[PDB]
Design a protein around this ligand. Structure first.
Ligand SMILES: *C(=O)/C=C/c1ccc(O)cc1
Length: 124
């Protein structure tokens, strides 16, 4: 696919993509419901994090997959922006749960589809 991380209209462009098209992106992409359960998880993300994109669907991102993100600086921003319905935040973060610590840039943005929220990731 031909979509850049951080693009202004990213939520419109990604709405057309099934799992296979999402796997064509240059950056990691996760879709979460408002509780943090994983709805979609692409190949680029699995390459960064080590997780098997097929196995993490249905797991809770904050409680089980990514406890290092269960903090005010990541989960706190997510749950606030879900509550307001206007989630659009970008920040760097380090992933260090049972993995070599890996610093990334994270972009969380509310999707167009109902009860759906994007988490985009690239290496920094
Ligand atoms: C900290 O526990 C981060 C874990 C993590 C981040 C992103 C993923 O896609 C998977 C696990």
């Amino acid at each position: 696919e031909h979509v850049a991380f951080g693009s202004e209209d990213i939520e419109n462009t990604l709405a057309k993509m099934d799992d296979g098209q999402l796997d064509g992106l240059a950056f990691g992409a996760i879709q979460l419901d408002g509780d943090g359960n994983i709805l979609q998880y692409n190949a680029a993300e699995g390459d960064i994090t080590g997780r098997d994109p097929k196995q993490v669907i249905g797991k809770n991102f904050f409680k089980d997959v990514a406890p290092c993100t269960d903090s005010p600086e990541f989960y706190g921003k997510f749950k606030e922006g879900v509550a307001s319905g206007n989630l659009n935040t970008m920040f760097e973060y380090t992933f260090d749960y049972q993995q070599t610590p890996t610093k990334v840039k994270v972009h969380m943005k509310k999707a167009l589809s109902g009860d759906s929220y994007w988490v985009f990731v690239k290496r920094v």
